[PDB]
Design a protein around this ligand. Structure first.
Ligand code: NA
Ligand code: NA
Ligand code: NA
Ligand code: NA
Ligand code: NA
Lengths: 367, 367
């Protein structure tokens, strides 16, 4: 079996990865070694199946002995250790959740249900570095995989509804804490049937602007609001989050010609699920029934939700998707602009297909 | 002095209207009469230094004695009374917030900062029925009016982030109460520094799908989620909310040729503000500086927010816009599809320009 090291397994993304690996019994097929910085020397996690000890995440010798390394530690860790490992002559496999190495020429962005062909070709051509793609793009491709696989996409315009988990654990806690502040401030009024709605709203609105809401992580309030800007501002007017759409979509698919992908990435008051609205320009006029068939046939997670009111309300929402591996796509119909214009709405959990799942599956392929 | 009757003045939209009328001293030039659908006989609001009794909203003789009727009562009321009132020989002015008469041949959809010419022509041509437009369309036009007025729009695709107020007062209370349930369920964990984020989220997620949350008004949860379907299902696959986009935009502007308007209307966890993401196809390559100038020059409420990170976070959000008459537009840049593809993000209060304000302004013109 292969000797596999795990870095950042206690972080949020790493914890989801561990959860999934235990669910799939992935530790029975490998010889796992766990790393740490604040708990080195302590016993390895029992769920790992070994009686080992937590190794030093910065001990190069401990790392060099491994065949595979799966890290969810972050960019800073990768930027320090990855180069040192490669410079030492280490030719093992590096599976990373951080975005740092995504655009490197010797790295492949992984999402096997979509680009297994790219992964296989890379493995045969000496690629030893595999990086998960941005949550937004990975979820988009999991849901719309059938359209891209059949080369039916001319261009894609998107408007996202992104969850707090994308920001981080403390961001999620900030969102929930804010919900508590808003409700608590008008709890008495809500409990009073005769209270005036405009009195309730005024109080919530005023509190939101009061400066009393904790906003250290998002900068501004999120509960009851939204923020139409995610990540650093670029010279072309895009946010880095929006820039990743075209950059990563094309690298994941290894397109022969650039497929334009652009839009607005907005942070909303959701915990883990990213929802996305699309305006897709098709290369040709294909019927909706054919579109539904192609999307559903691509992979088992792209559940097609019939374009009917009640079922959409029940299945195409964060409430129905959080914590699941399903990446449903619905509201499929042609837009008024023409038969080559397709509308679509998707939902997907940011921590699974958008983070940990592609890593677990890549590791399984190498086991 | 015109005799003006008010219906549905006690409800949420009516209350916002009353508040605005008080702020602008709109009761001074008219003789106000207040009606009730179930409380006739009780004292009437002592607005504009007047006193009286609530009249019967269903008494045709009482209604016929008026010169102008301003109703925020709703479609069911309009559908029952309007035809009977007109058939009884009433030739007064009917100003309505309900969608009922919007597409009638003898009615004009009003948004004066955008279509005063249409309103003026209608008045001279005998039109006596004026109806406010859908909140989505009215807010879109208040923000993007400059692009339409200069006939630069080929087509527009939209993704909305609609507030609960569009559903109603009960809907808003349901959202806030749900926020209370979600936070309350994990309040102890949030207050514990060492608590694990995944344990917190697991509980919130489970509670959300438990069936314990109150959802009588929206059907499914809204706090921490969203619903990509608003109003009745139509045969073309659109929801009625989405259908109003093209129908009302073209009628408000009185276009010579149909401008395609389509997209997805999504309900989100906001109280009063609607936000909208746009993909606009221009008829020609217009520079962003020119676009900014045209938008700002159209009307005083179309605040152009510079496409910069920090200012966008502070001003292009529901938190910054709720309760104000400002209808800001930002994130203006060209999309990767080409120089004729324009991106824009708008925010606007649903109860003001999206409901009550157009009515107040129309009344002022008839006083
Ligand atoms: Na071996
Ligand atoms: Na840092
Ligand atoms: Na259908
Ligand atoms: Na007269
Ligand atoms: Na700029």
């Amino acid at each position: 079996m292969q000797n596999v090291g795990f870095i950042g397994w206690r972080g949020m993304v790493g914890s989801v990865l561990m959860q999934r690996m235990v669910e799939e019994r992935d530790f029975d097929a490998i010889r796992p070694v766990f790393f740490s910085t604040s708990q080195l020397g302590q016993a390895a996690p029992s769920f790992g199946g070994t009686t080992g000890t937590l190794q030093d995440a910065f001990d190069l010798e401990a790392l060099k002995a491994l065949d595979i390394i799966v890290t969810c530690q972050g960019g800073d860790y990768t930027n320090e250790i990855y180069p040192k490992l490669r410079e030492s002559g280490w030719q093992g496999y590096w599976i990373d959740a951080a975005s740092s190495l995504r655009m490197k020429d010797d790295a492949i962005i992984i999402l096997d249900p979509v680009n297994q062909d790219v992964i296989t070709d890379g493995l045969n051509n000496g690629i030893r570095t595999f990086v998960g793609g941005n949550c937004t793009v990975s979820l988009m491709l999991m849901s719309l995989g059938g359209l891209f696989a059949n080369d039916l996409v001319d261009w894609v315009s998107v408007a996202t509804y992104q969850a707090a988990s994308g920001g981080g654990a403390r961001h999620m806690r900030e969102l929930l804490t804010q919900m508590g502040h808003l409700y608590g401030h008008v709890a008495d009024e809500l409990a009073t049937p005769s209270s005036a709605i405009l009195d309730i709203e005024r109080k919530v609105t005023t509190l939101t602007r009061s400066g009393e809401l904790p906003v250290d992580n998002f900068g501004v309030p999120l509960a009851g609001s939204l923020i139409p800007w995610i990540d650093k501002q670029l010279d072309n007017g895009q946010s880095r989050e929006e820039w990743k759409g075209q950059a990563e979509t094309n690298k994941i698919l290894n397109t022969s010609s650039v497929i334009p992908v652009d839009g607005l990435c907005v942070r909303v008051g959701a915990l883990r699920c990213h929802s996305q609205a699309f305006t897709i320009k098709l290369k040709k006029d294909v019927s909706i029934p054919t579109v539904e068939e192609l999307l559903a046939a691509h992979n088992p997670w792209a559940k097609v939700v019939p374009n009917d009111r009640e079922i959409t309300m029940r299945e195409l929402t964060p409430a129905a998707v959080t914590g699941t591996l399903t990446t449903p796509v619905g509201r499929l119909r042609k837009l008024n602009m023409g038969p080559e214009f397709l509308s679509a709405f998707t939902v997907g959990d940011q921590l699974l297909w958008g983070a940990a799942e592609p890593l677990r599956r890549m590791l399984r392929q190498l086991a």
